[PDB]
Structure formats: C-alpha cells, structure tokens
Design a protein around this ligand. Structure first.
Ligand SMILES: Nc1ncnc2c1ncn2[C@@H]1O[C@H](COP(=O)(O)OP(=O)(O)OP(O)(O)=S)[C@@H](O)[C@H]1O
Ligand SMILES: Nc1ncnc2c1ncn2[C@@H]1O[C@H](COP(=O)(O)OP(=O)(O)O)[C@@H](O)[C@H]1O
Ligand SMILES: [Mg+2]
Ligand SMILES: [Mg+2]
Lengths: 471, 40, 128, 578, 578
C-alpha cells in the first residue's frame, strides 16, 4: 500500500502482452507500472497470475522495453478511478489522466472501474419520457430516461451529427407528465474510443457552441492513441456517470462514440491470449464484456439520478448480422438504425424506422405521460410505412401504372413520410408537432384503413393536411 | 456586450485570491498532517 | 455568456492545484530534512523492518552508506546481507532471494504514492 | 473437508493445488472471501474450479476449501413470491444487506429461517413412510404447500410435532431410525427428481395467445422453443405466458438477459391478478434472475436451479410452467468456460457436450405421477437467441430435435410491428393429434376441423404468394385473390394479438374458436358469391369485415352475443344481396 | 552494443539468441552482410528480428548486432527530386554502386554527404530555441528548405556558422548545452511528429479531376481512400493527383506494386512542369519505391518512411500530398509477419491489430500549426486493392472507418473504359459541407447550388435507368427520356476525363463550373421546349449538344470565350426555334 514492491525479470514481451515471473503478490486484475531503462513509466493490468509467472497487458506501446532493464511495480490491487464532482468541466485521456492542462482531480472517492452489477430489486422501471426533438425517435422509437438506445450506423453515415443533435436537444416534459421538478439539463459523459481528429473536433465545436462543456466529462482516446486504453475508457466513463447519477442526483447522458473500436481492441487482446473465438474471430466472452458496460445504465429506486446510454457503433459492411451489432442488440434496449439509402436521398436524420426499435417505449408513452394516441399512431405509421415499402417492391417488378388506387395512396404516403417526417434537418420538433405531422401523414389514407387506431382518436385528430402544419 | 465578461473575470480573480488566502491559514496544519501520515 | 463561468471555474481549479502543489513541495522539503533528526536511525530502521517483513527471505539489504551503520544490528539479527549504494539517498531497498523481486521504502516514494489518497484530506483541512 | 491453495487465476477460472480427494462438480470456497466455486477438472494434485462470483482482486496462495457436496437448493416453503440469483440467494436480502449493488461473498439462506409456518400434520406415529409422501401441509399464499419426504428417505414415523407455528429448521417429523425430517430438504440441481411414472400428455398448456394455443399448441407436459433475432419479441411472449398461463406455479429463469426485464416483472406482477387463484400474480411466480453483467458461470447454475424448483413444485401435484428466458446465453457461458478449459470445441466453438446438456435439461419436463401418487407436470418454454438470426447455429438445431413445439419468430413481421410475429411457415407442433379429444370435449366438437381448415387456408395463401410476387396480386383470378384476402384477414384479425392491450392481451379458447368460425363462414359465403358472379372488390368493402376485425377487441364475457350477431350479419350480408 | 548469434531462420524472420538487453523495435544488423532488421518480440535470451531484406543463404550462428535505435529517417535537404527504397536508401546510388540488380546489404546514406548547400542563418548567439523552430533556410530547387530544430531539442544558441556553403554533416548551430545541430536530424518512423495544434481543414485539395474535385471533394488536411479491383484506375488517379494537384510537395509511396510505374514516373516527371512553381515536376516529388518483388517486410517500412517524410515537409510550412499507391500490400506484409510469429489471425488471416496500424497511419494527416508557428497540412490518399473487388474485406472496411472521403471505383465502368470510373452512387465525401465557404468565394457564389443540381440529376437518372432497362426506353415519358439523356450527357462530357489527353488531363474549378453550368442551362432549355410541344428527338440533334460534349477538350486559357459562345448558342438553339 505504502511501499513499492518492484519486479524485474521480464521473460516475454510481444504485442500487447508482457510476462513477468515470480510475481506471486500481484493480484488478478491489479494495475502495475512498467518502467524501462529510459525511465518512462507505462501502464498495465494483470490478466492472468500463476505461481510461475503473471501475464500483464500493456496499455501503451511496447517500444523501448527490454528484458534486462524493464521493471514492473504494483500500483493497486483493484483498478480504481478517483472520482469527484470537479470532473464536470474537465477533459481526460483514455486512462483518466487530464489532458486540458489543469491540475489532477482531487478524489473524493476511489471507485473500481469495473463496477458492480445493479441489484434487480434495487432497480426501478424507467418511465420518464425524453423529448429528443426527432420525429422518428420521439413518436416511433421513444427514448425514456435510463434507456440503452445505441445508434446503428455505417462508415459515411452522420451518426455523430445525430448524437450531437440529441445531446443538445434532449429534454423531459414534466408538464405533459404532471410534474414540476424542472430538472436542470443533462450532464454529458463523453467517451471516445479511437476517435478521429475530424469527429473529435466536430464534437468539441458542437459542445462549445451549445455551452455543454461546463457540465461534460470527456474521456478521449484518439485514433493515434494506444489501442489497449479502449479497454479502460468505457469503464472509467461509466464509473464517473454512475457516481454522479447515484451519489449526486445528476441526470447523466453517456455517449460512446465508437464501440467498434472497443470491440477491435477486445478482439486483439483475445487473439493475443489464444482465446476460443466467437464469430469472425471475436472472443467468446465479448457478449459478457459488452454487457458489463451496457448494463451499468438505468434508474435506481429511491434515487433521483439516472444514467442514459447512447452508444454509437458502425456496422462494417452495413451488416446488421455482424457480431458487434448483434451482441449490442441482444444486450441493449433497442437500437436506432441509420439507413444509407435514405442518406443518399439527402434525408437527415437518415433513420429508417422499420429496423429501429425501442423496448422501453411503452413505459414512457400513453395517457398521462405524452398523449393517449401516441402508441396507436406509432403502430399505424409502422404498418402504413411497411405497406408502402411492399408496394415499392411490387412496382419494382410489375410497373407503377398497373397499380390500384390504394397502392398508389400507400406509395404517396411512404414518399411524403420520408420527405417530411423522417427528413427534418436540424430543427427541434416538439412531441406535439411530431404527432401533428404524423396525423397529417395518416390523413392521406382513408379513415377505414386506419385499423390500428381507435375511433375516438380518429374522430379527434384525423383530417389535417400537410400544408396546414407550416406555411 | 462585454461588461458581464469583465465582471466574470473580476469575480474569477477575486475568488482565486480568496481561496489562496483561505488556504494560507491551514497550510502548516496540512503539512503536519501529511508528515504524520507519510511517516511510519 | 457561459465563457465567464468557465473562466471562474478554471481560475479556482488552478488556484487550488497551485495550493496543493505548494503543500506538496513544502512537505517534500520537510521530509528531506529527516537525516538531521536524532530519530533518523529509528525511522530508517522502522521502514527497513517494514520492507523486510514485506519481502520474506530477502537476500540482501541496500541503503545509503551513511544510512548503512544504523541498520547493521538489524541486518545481523535478521540474517540478511547488508550492502551500500549512494544512489538511494534516503531509503532502504532489499534485493530479494532470487534477485528479481525487489522492495523499496524511500520516503519520497511513500510521499508520492500516498499523495493521491491524502489529497482529499489535505483539501478538506485547507478549506473544507 | 479438503483444504488447498490457489495456483492460477484467469478470469472466472481458478486452479487449485493440493486438493486430492476432491470430487467432480463439488462446491468449493475460493479465497479467503469464500467465493462459491465448482470443480470441473481434476488433474493429479490440482483441481480446476469455476467461480460463480467475480475473481478480481484474488491472489495466488489463498486457501481453497471443498465442501464435498454438489450444488444443491433448499426446497420448501418460502420460495414463492421471491426472486433468487443463480445460486438461489434471495435478492431482497442481498439488497437490504449490501445496498443497491450486488457485492461478492454474501452468504444468506435461500429460505427465511425467521418466518413461522402453520404446520398441519397428516401422518401419525407408527406409520411407515416412503420418499415423496406428504408429511403435512402448510399455507403459503393460498396454495397448500405439502411437506414432502426426501426422495431417498425410508422409515417409520416415531414422533410428529403438533399443529402450530414452526420454522423451516424445526424437525417436524422424526423417524424410528433417528433421522429428523424438517420443512425443507436439499437436492442436487444436476440430478433429476425421481418419479413413479411419466404420463402421456392429454391436456393443453393454455398460453393465452391465439396462434400459440390454436395453430401450434403445446401440451401440459410438453416442451416448446421460441427462437428468433433480437427485437422479434420472444421476451414479451414469455412474459405474456407468465401472466396468462393456466399453470399453478410459474418459474421464470432470467438466464443471462437484461435486468430491466426482471425489474419490470418485479414491479408489474404484484399489481396483477392470478387468472385462477384471484390473488396477486406474483404469489405464484418464482424468479431466478441472473442478469447479463452477473458472473458467467452462474447462468448454468440458474438454469438448473429453475428446473429443480419446477420439479419440486411438480412433486406437490401442481402444473408448473418453466420459462428459460435464453438458453443461448447458457451455451455462450459453456463456451467461455470451455475456452478457459483449453479443450477442443465443437462447431461454432461450443463444447461437444452442449447437445447432451440441452437434452438433459429438456427431458426433465413432462406430465408424471409423483412419488406420492399424485399427478403433476412441468412445461418448459425455452427461448433461443441465434447469432444474427441464423437458425442453423448449433443451439437451435439441437433444440429442434428434442422439443415438441417450435414457435419460430420472423424478423420481417417484427419490423412491420405485427405481433406475436410467429413465422407460421417455419413453426410446427407435435401435440396437435394428442390434444384433439380435449378440444372436442372442452371447446367444441368441430374445433379440430376448423383448425385444419384455417391451416389449409394459410397453406393455400402461402402457395399462392409465389405467384403473387411473380405477376402481382391483380393478375390472379377472383377465387385466388379471395384466398389471398382471406389469408390477409386471418393474419390481421386472428393471428395478430396485442400483448399490451387491456382486452386483447388474453384470449380464451372459446373466443378464438368463435373468430375462426366467423372467418370460415365469411370465406365460404364469399366463395359462393364469387361463383355467383359477385366481384371481389365489393366483397372486400362489406361492413361485416369491420366486425370481423374488431372481434378480437371484445371482452370475454361480452363475446358470445357479439359472435352470434356477427354470424347473423355474415349470413345476411351475402344472402340479402342475391 | 548488444550482440548475439542467429538461432533460427524462417523466411523474413530471424530469431537471434544472446540478445539480452535488446529493446523492442530496435534496428539490428543480421548476419555478416549486415542486413537491416527490426525486433518485434523478446523472449528470454532470444529476440525475434523482422528482416527487411532477403534472408536466403543465411546460416545459423552468424552474428547479430543491435544498434540500440529504432527505424529512423534522415530528414533534411536532399530528399526532393530523389527516389528511395523501403528503408530510405537512394536507388540512384544503389544503381551506381551495384548495377541493374538490387543486391542486399548495400549501405548508403539517405542524404548526400558531399553536396554543398547555401546555408544562411536566422538565429543569433544567445537566442532561445525549441523543437520545430527554424534555424535557417537553404535553397534546394527554388523551394526554401528550412533547417528545423529537432522536436525534442531545447536550449540556448551559443555559436552559429556565419554563411556560405556547408555539407549536411557540418554543425551549423551549437547550443550552450554542447549539443551540435546539423542540417539534418533523425526521427523514428513509428512516432508521429508533434505539432502545436490541429486545425479544421477548410481549403480543398484540388486534384485536377472533375469528379473528385466537384462531387466528392477532399480538404487539404483530409484523408481519402480509393479502393477498386485491378484495372480500375487507382494508379492512374494517383499519378494524375501527383502531376496536377496544388500541393507544394508530393510524396509517392509505391508499396509493393509494379516497378514499371516507378520507371514511368522517373521518366515522365522530369519532362513535366510544376503547376505552381513552374519548374520541373520531379523537383517537388519524393518517391519511396518498394516493388512487389522487393522484400515483403520492407513495405511497412516504406509506408512509415513516406508518411514521416510528408510530416517533416509539413513541419516546414508546406502543403504535402501523400499517396500510398497500395495499402493492401502493407496489410499482406503484416499478415506474413504475423504468420511467421504464429499469432492468432483475425478474419481473412490478417493480424487483429491491422485496424490499429491503419488508423495510426491515417491519423498522421491533417492541417496543423507547426511547432515553429507556421501552418502546414498533409493529405493522404491511400489506394486499396480488395481481392476480387470485394469491399467487405478487412482492409477496406478498416480504412472506411477513419478516412473522410471514399472514392469507390467500379469494374463495370473500367471494362467499358468510362474513366476515371468513379462509382458516384457508392462514393461519398465528408468535406463537401466544410468547403462551401471557400467555393462561394473562389469559384462562384452559386457553385454549391449547381453541384447539388448536377447530383440530383444524376440521382434521378440512376433511378430512372432501372425502369428504362427493365421495361424499355420507348415506354418512358418525354421528361423521363430527357432526364436520361441529360444524365448520359453528364456522364460522357463532365464525369469522364482522359488522363492521357494533353488538355483534358487537368481541369480547373472554373472550367468544371462552366461545363456544368452549360449542362444545366441546356437541361432547362430542353425542359422548356418539351413543355411547349417540342419533340425530344429534335432536341437531341442540335449541334449545341456536340459543342457541350467537346467543351471539356478546350484549353484553360481559351475556355472563357468558348463558354460565353456556348451559352449564347444554348440560348439561340431554342429562341430561334421559338
Ligand atoms: N483516368 C483515366 N483516364 C484514362 N485512362 C485511364 C484512366 N484510369 C485508368 N485508365 C486506363 O486503365 C489502365 C489501368 O489503370 P491503372 O491505374 O493502372 O489500374 P490500377 O487499378 O491502378 O492498377 P492495379 O492492377 O489495380 S495496382 C491504364 O493503363 C489506362 O489505360
Ligand atoms: N405480442 C406482442 N405485442 C406487442 N408488442 C410486442 C409483442 N411481442 C413483442 N412486442 C414488442 O417487441 C419489442 C421487443 O420485444 P422483446 O421481447 O423485448 O425483444 P426480444 O424478445 O428480442 O428480447 C417491444 O417493443 C415489444 O413491445
Ligand atoms: Mg428480451
Ligand atoms: Mg495500379
């Protein structure tokens, strides 16, 4: 604890691994300092310990290490991070070291970065509606407070722009829910794994423009930074988020800008260990490793704070069946999938609702929360859009001029839907405005075709035209 | 307008001076505590 | 409008960090004066005992040549070899039986190892 | 009691040394914290232990102690209305003892030792008793919890305690041999509880879902599988089964899935009502929750604990429904353990014995005659999570060969927000033939004929869909277009079922039978009109189609009048036009 | 120095025993020939050396000497107008010393040690200097080569050479610390050169090709990828960028490709003219040539040497365009090295860290503020060679996640010889929105509007082409046929560009803007004519169409008059018709 137990005799250095022998006192998962003959000190974590030798994964690159002068010393038996409320306006690298030039955080507590699983009894049901300002999210894939809603995107798709828009536009609607807390805006914990300078600059510029940096905690592991620090970056970010939310009543929104880089680092570590792989070479424990990150969000009974996670990942060949998006969808509570065909049409945000999903949507919508017709309108929109897509597929073969009247009506609905409901640009839409637009689109269809909406709601809202929403 | 900016920077320097003055009171106490804790 | 409160927060954080750095350098200066203390043999013997009990079966003990005579009796009692090295100015280092595992108990090492844990207490004593 | 020390630590795997005499699959105390572990390889003087808790912070040389017993659960009063982890630890006690976070090393009994139960003996001293006999009865939540003899205990009753309040640790019955029988007993989770006989399943497991109860029924003692990609809705269907099934006791196992589902079950179930008892729904439900971020090795333990609890409740004469929320997570846990074991994997990295484990788990269900001579059954509905929806993955294929029912989910239906989203073409059930007499006796003498007519109509629609996608729907003849439209009407009005609707969430057999009869009558009369020269487009706009579509939203008690007036409207709307 | 003997030889990999004390990624002289190798793994008393030269004929027991330094490049005057191998050895000197064949073991200095340079100082005795600060300037080929302090060197200037001609070995500046600073310094190829700050790129990298400079622009500090099958036109595009771009310095890395391409460059570039300086084109170009038949391990070294040289020229304030003619060859070299290491491969046999290496290489680009206070930028255009045109292969997918532009080539266009064969449907650029303020001030205020109109017309043509192909062009409306004809005109007159034509090879922004303005004006006039009963077939016979088609062959200095006359003729061809 107070004395520096120091180990020499490195026996094997290759890639991200480092073998040291006679290291019996190094506990499993402990953090160590690796000092070479130059005197520069690297970082490392024990991933396997035996009576003969201990296996240590190196965070920084192994350049300069030699088996004669390299030395390994223990730091702490458990990987802990010093958290405090003063982090709310600071920037840190992938391993939690400050990079903004300010002095290091004085730690009120030292929490383990791995964290502990939330007791299901201690959890409470997430039911607070968050108005993101996006019609395809608020109406059809509603995001509630404490939800895990990743954004499934591609290479050139504007996932970062959508995330910034959500971060700067997210707000609860206590008036609609009959509440008057008027809670202060979200605290943002931004974790970057292998982010490029372009995306990082865009995010920083957006946060400076919106003034959200004063209440943002930034963990930035850039693309030129060591790849192994991506193992610790989400752990530290979520440790800070959980600490803030569940010890200071903050409403924390967490953005993981690229989980594909995290999965690549995990695959590299697993392949260095000759672990039995899953699909496409990823380690078999990748599901559990991703779960230990995702399941750290939610709302706890008896506590006002909350943690909302919006991870971002890029399906490599726009492949939804890739192991990373598949495991993420199996763990998280839905997904917001971006559409490249919609993006090529100039539609922003390019969110196609058909593969998108929100598992906790029904908890935060309905009478007394947003509006009585919300769920039925969402279902009707989904059915009508699916019908329009099917008619598009049909006219792709049999020709457009051979259709009936209702098929043409469904094609018109799908076209106007994509042009107006999905395509909204950078404007912020209230839930009432989005519902009005959705009803205007649904009015393009005959009253008898709205089988999924109750008669009362149809009588109350059906009739408005698209040209009546805006001049 | 930058009058609010001038007020903010004046407040910042005033708070820095105040926190330094407050820290000057218990500097020796903190040093003694550090020496007591570090020494076996 | 927000840039002003960023300036205020950065100024307060910088002042607090500078105060903590002043505390750290002052305690380092106070700690470096321990060789002139009459109880310096006592404290070096205590820390050498801690290092030896933290490293069972230590082959040799390494310390400053001026610090060497103060530990001769303890080295003879524990049956551990005693060596001198001027590089280690104010600490005691054990070589270990195999020569690979080494334990070091310098005062500066203890200070900059426990500073992270003591920062909260120092801050709460200074202001809190 | 055998001692030992840690030799190697690598994730959830700990290798001990100096453990001669340790037996396979025994429970071990790993480290000074006493973490629960299980021996899975013996190699000379070393023992390979998988730890059911996090191994972070452990050091080489810490003691390892073998309890000498396999993983066992405490079976007795107190399991109902509670939630347990993979090792059968009460999560309420863990919460009140350690806070909002689950800390490792917590020790707490599965059954509360403080609560007192109203003992009502029904055996007398001098009576010879065999394993599985009912010593007495205890009220728990309106259920009559029978105190059973352990399955491997024989003797004659020497003394029996009088009726009154006692704890589960009190020796209520003492035999002439001196053995003391308490209100609870332990049982290894990996050993199936013995039964006198296994009966042929003749009664259906009513799930409350029209498609599952009609087209692909599962018997009371049968086994069903519901695989699908993420977002298809298998968890929602399993929750609906837990809410609406006619099983006496429901055992829900959250094997390696989202904890918010367990939270939703914990919060919403107490506010619901038992469909048969009338009390709270949670009073008949036992939860074994092992969330995704909980230790991997605990998933298999949770599955076996759930199946053992289901078997125990079956031994009391109850009809038990067991839902494993995901068996693919158990397979992944086995794969990770094998990867730590450094053994040669089977296809897709799973250990070779995965199929054997799945078969052993699924074959513990069935309608049986208990050791006490009573009747009981266990129904297992296991969900599967194939990677990327690939049904060819080993877990799904191995499940195909052992289950009697297969409720395949389609991602295309889920995308259209059409639920339960059961892929009719890819689904099947082997219990249809055996359940026909029950349907005739309890639903209608012509129910199998209507079900077969519906199935034939769906088959005809499927066989016309290729022509539809080849030349379009308008290119078909009036009869074929009528068949297509009747299939669409069936899909929209009978197969479709909103689990969140206040009325459509549940549907009895009578309501489904009435809807099927209405659809068949409408189809026959529409075909007669088609032969009569009536065009299909005015048939598709008849007012009675609204009645047919809205029939599923009518309440159960109001339904029969609606059904008879709908039949009258169906016959009138075709006879009157002529 | 640490020295040992060879223990094992297996392809390009040599294991040397007795290397206790050797550091990772240090340069080692393997064998009596002194072959250059790099340590990539340490184990006990042995080291794993990756040899950058041919290992045939080596024997076990030959000495291995570790230099104690990583792979470093000499950065200074003399690199321009030259060609280097993978490890920065002048191929001209190698030819002069060995002949027409490249033999292993040749030791030659990267910079000529005998050439005199007109040194002129800028610092004075007593001045304070830091890393990246300019000491003085040296004329090389009209370029002002600034002598930079090494990034890690800091001190106070004591002595400065007055003036005159000195070799690169002469110490021009001596600090008070005793450090001697020469005209050159060594920098490790694997460490990115530090910068003061990174700026958002807001100036287009004018490649000279219409489609790349208009539809998918790349900024000055941006990164672009151009993958495609063989024969698609990657090398031609790279050479066109080298010849016609507005970069101050061009660095071309021939990683594992044909030698004939390097010969073509070395022959043609001296005869060409620099578009900016006006001197010989080769004076601004640096070639790092590692042909496919050269040692495979040297490809990675060539890539790193090229990127480090580009960064060094950036640090002097120049705008550098770096082209990696094929990064797939570097990926294959990494795969071979990993195979020798017996590491566990990722998908398709590549090492799991290939994505990390590609990200590190591509992140070294960007517009930055140099340590000397000057502004510089590095543009990286990396070509990828997916097997069989499969864009799903790991290298292309890893490159896609980092680069800001994606210039996808199509084999179908190359077979028809529609060049540059950029697939505008699958291509994208993330710099289009950032460059709009520059376009509105430097080419035209309505240039983004015209570009968007052209892109929309292309999208409409692509959408209607499927219908035309499936049904037939005679079944479409007149307006749809006009859209198809305008799309064809765009494809064959504006997107197409002959790189071997003496005029069409380079196209300024003004010329492309004029061409697309003429196309849009013709489209509007044809729409107006069709809306007033004019037949489309009459429109297609206008000679104005031929004028527009041949507009792209008009020289830059003649172009404005041709544009004015063609606009007048566009108006007249429909006003005279009335
Ligand atoms: N822009 C262009 N203009 C005219 N001809 C072109 C153009 N691009 C390609 N070509 C022709 O296509 C041939 C092949 O082009 P390359 O650039 O060599 O293809 P490549 O894909 O770069 O080579 P590999 O095999 O993939 S390394 C050239 O020799 C030209 O004849
Ligand atoms: N029968 C149903 N009725 C209504 N919604 C359903 C039904 N089945 C599934 N869903 C919807 O499907 C979505 C995902 O369901 P869920 O079961 O949680 O996913 P998964 O089964 O893959 O774990 C939710 O939005 C839920 O409302
Ligand atoms: Mg689920
Ligand atoms: Mg080429």
């Amino acid at each position: 604890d107070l004395l520096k137990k120091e180990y020499t005799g490195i026996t094997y250095i290759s890639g991200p691994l480092l073998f040291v022998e006679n290291a019996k006192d190094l506990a499993y998962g402990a953090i160590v300092d690796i000092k070479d003959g130059t005197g520069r000190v690297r970082g490392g974590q024990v991933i396997e310990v035996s009576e003969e030798y201990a296996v240590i994964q190196v965070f920084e690159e192994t350049t300069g290490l030699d088996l004669a002068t390299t030395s390994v010393s223990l730091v702490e038996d458990v990987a802990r991070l010093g958290v405090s409320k003063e982090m709310l306006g600071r920037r840190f690298n992938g391993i939690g070291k400050p990079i903004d030039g300010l002095p290091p955080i004085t730690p009120e507590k030292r929490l383990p970065i791995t964290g502990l699983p939330l007791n299901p009894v201690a959890r409470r049901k997430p039911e607070q509606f968050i108005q993101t300002g996006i019609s395809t999210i608020d109406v059809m894939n509603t995001l509630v407070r404490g939800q895990k809603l990743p954004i499934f995107s591609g290479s050139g798709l504007p996932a970062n722009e959508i995330a910034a828009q959500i971060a700067r536009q997210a707000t609860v609607r206590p008036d609609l829910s009959g509440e008057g807390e008027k809670e202060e805006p979200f605290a943002v914990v931004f974790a970057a794994m292998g982010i490029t300078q372009r995306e990082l600059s865009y995010f920083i510029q957006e946060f400076e423009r919106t003034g959200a940096l004063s209440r943002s905690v930034l963990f930035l592991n850039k693309a030129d930074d060591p790849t192994i620090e991506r193992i610790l970056t989400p752990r530290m970010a979520l440790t800070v988020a959980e600490y803030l939310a569940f010890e200071h009543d903050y409403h924390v929104l967490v953005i993981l800008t690229d989980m594909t880089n995290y999965c690549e680092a995990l695959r590299e570590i697993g392949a260095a260990r000759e672990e039995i792989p899953g699909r496409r070479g990823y380690p078999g424990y990748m599901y559990t490793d991703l779960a230990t990150i995702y399941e750290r969000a939610g709302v706890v009974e008896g506590k006002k704070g909350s943690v909302t996670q919006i991870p971002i990942l890029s399906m490599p060949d726009d492949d939804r069946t890739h192991p990373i998006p598949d495991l993420t969808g199996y763990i998280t509570e839905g997904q917001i999938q971006l559409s490249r065909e919609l993006h090529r049409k100039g539609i922003y945000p390019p969110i196609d609702p058909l593969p998108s999903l929100s598992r906790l949507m029904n908890n935060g919508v309905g009478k007394g929360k947003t509006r009585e017709d919300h769920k039925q309108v969402s279902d009707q929109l989904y059915s009508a859009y699916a019908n329009g897509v099917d008619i598009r597929k049909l006219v792709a073969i049999i020709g457009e001029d051979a259709l009936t009247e209702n098929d043409r009506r469904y094609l018109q609905f799908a076209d106007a839907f994509e042009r107006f409901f999905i395509n909204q640009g950078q404007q912020n839409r209230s839930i009432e405005e989005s519902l009005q637009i959705a009803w205007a689109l649904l009015s393009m269809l005959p009253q008898g075709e709205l089988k999924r909406i109750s008669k009362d709601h149809i009588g109350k809202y059906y009739g408005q035209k698209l040209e009546e929403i805006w001049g | 307008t930058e009058a609010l900016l001038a007020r903010y920077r004046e407040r910042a320097e005033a708070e820095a001076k105040a926190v330094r003055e407050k820290a000057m009171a218990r500097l020796d106490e903190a040093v003694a505590l550090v020496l007591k804790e570090v020494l076996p | 409008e927000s840039a002003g409160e960023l300036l205020v927060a950065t100024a307060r954080t910088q002042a607090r960090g500078e105060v903590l750095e002043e505390v750290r350098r002052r305690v380092r200066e106070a700690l470096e004066a321990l060789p002139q203390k009459p109880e310096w043999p006592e404290v070096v013997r205590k820390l050498a005992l801690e290092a030896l009990e933290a490293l069972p079966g230590a082959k040799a003990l390494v310390a400053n040549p001026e610090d060497l005579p103060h530990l001769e009796a303890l080295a003879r009692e524990r049956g551990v070899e005693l060596q001198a090295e001027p590089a280690l100015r104010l600490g005691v280092r054990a070589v270990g039986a195999e020569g690979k595992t080494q334990v070091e108990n310098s005062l500066l090492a203890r200070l900059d190892r426990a500073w992270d844990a003591l920062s909260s207490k120092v801050a709460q004593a200074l202001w809190g | 009691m055998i001692q030992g020390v840690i030799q190697k630590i690598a994730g959830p795997a700990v290798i001990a040394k100096g453990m001669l005499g340790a037996r396979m699959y025994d429970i071990c105390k790993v480290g000074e914290e006493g973490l629960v572990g299980e021996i899975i390889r013996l190699d000379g003087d070393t023992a390979f232990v998988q730890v059911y808790e996090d191994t972070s912070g452990l050091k080489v040389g810490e003691p390892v102690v073998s309890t000498g017993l396999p993983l066992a659960v405490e079976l007795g009063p107190g399991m109902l209305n509670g939630i347990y982890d993979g090792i059968q630890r009460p999560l309420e006690r863990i919460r009140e003892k350690t806070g909002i976070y689950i800390t490792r090393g917590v020790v707490v009994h599965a059954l509360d030792r403080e609560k007192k139960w109203a003992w009502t003996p029904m055996v007398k001293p001098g009576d010879e008793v065999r394993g599985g006999m009912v010593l007495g009865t205890v009220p728990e939540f309106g259920f009559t919890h029978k105190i059973l003899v352990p399955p491997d205990v024989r003797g004659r009753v020497k003394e029996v305690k009088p009726a009154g309040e006692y704890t589960v640790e009190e020796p209520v019955v003492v035999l002439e041999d001196g053995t003391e029988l308490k209100m609870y007993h332990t049982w290894p989770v990996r050993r199936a509880r013995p039964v006198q006989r296994k009966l042929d399943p003749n009664t259906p497991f009513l799930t409350g879902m029209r498609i599952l109860d009609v087209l692909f029924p599962v018997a009371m003692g049968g086994t069903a599988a519901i695989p699908g990609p993420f977002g298809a809705g298998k968890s929602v269907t399993q929750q609906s089964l837990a809410k609406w099934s006619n099983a006496d006791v429901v055992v829900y196992v959250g094997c390696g899935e989202r904890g918010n589902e367990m939270t939703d079950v914990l919060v919403e179930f107490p506010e619901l009502t038992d469909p048969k008892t009338g009390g709270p729904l949670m009073h008949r439900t036992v939860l074994i929750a092992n969330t995704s971020n909980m230790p991997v090795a605990a998933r298999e333990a949770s599955i076996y604990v759930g199946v053992t609890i289901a078997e125990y409740f079956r031994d009391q004469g109850f009809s038990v429904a067991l839902m494993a929320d995901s068996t693919s997570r158990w397979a992944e846990a086995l794969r990770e353990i094998s990867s730590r074991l450094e053994e040669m994997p089977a296809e897709e990295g799973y250990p070779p014995y995965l199929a054997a484990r799945l078969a052993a788990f699924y074959e513990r269900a069935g309608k049986v005659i208990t050791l006490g001579g009573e009747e009981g059954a266990v129904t297992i509905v296991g969900a599967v999570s194939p990677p990327g929806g690939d049904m060819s993955e080993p877990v799904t294929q191995s499940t195909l060969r052992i289950v009697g029912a297969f409720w395949r989910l389609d991602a295309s239906l889920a995308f259209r927000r059409h639920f339960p989203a059961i892929n009719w073409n890819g689904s099947y059930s082997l219990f249809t033939s055996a359940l026909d007499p029950w349907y005739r006796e309890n639903v209608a003498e012509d129910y199998p004929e209507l079900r077969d007519a519906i199935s034939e109509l769906l088959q005809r629609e499927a066989g016309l869909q290729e022509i539809v996608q080849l030349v379009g729907p308008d290119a078909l003849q009036d009869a074929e277009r009528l068949v297509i439209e009747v299939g669409r009407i069936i899909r929209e009005d009978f197969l479709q079922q909103n689990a969140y609707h206040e009325v459509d969430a549940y549907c009895s057999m009578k309501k489904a039978y009435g809807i099927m009869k209405m659809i068949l009558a409408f189809y026959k009369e529409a075909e007669a009109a088609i032969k009569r020269g009536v065009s299909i487009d005015e048939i598709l706009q008849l007012p009675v189609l609204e009645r047919i579509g809205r029939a599923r939203y009518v309440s159960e008690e109001e339904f029969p009048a609606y059904f008879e007036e709908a039949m009258k409207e169906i016959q009138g709307a075709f006879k009157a036009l002529a």
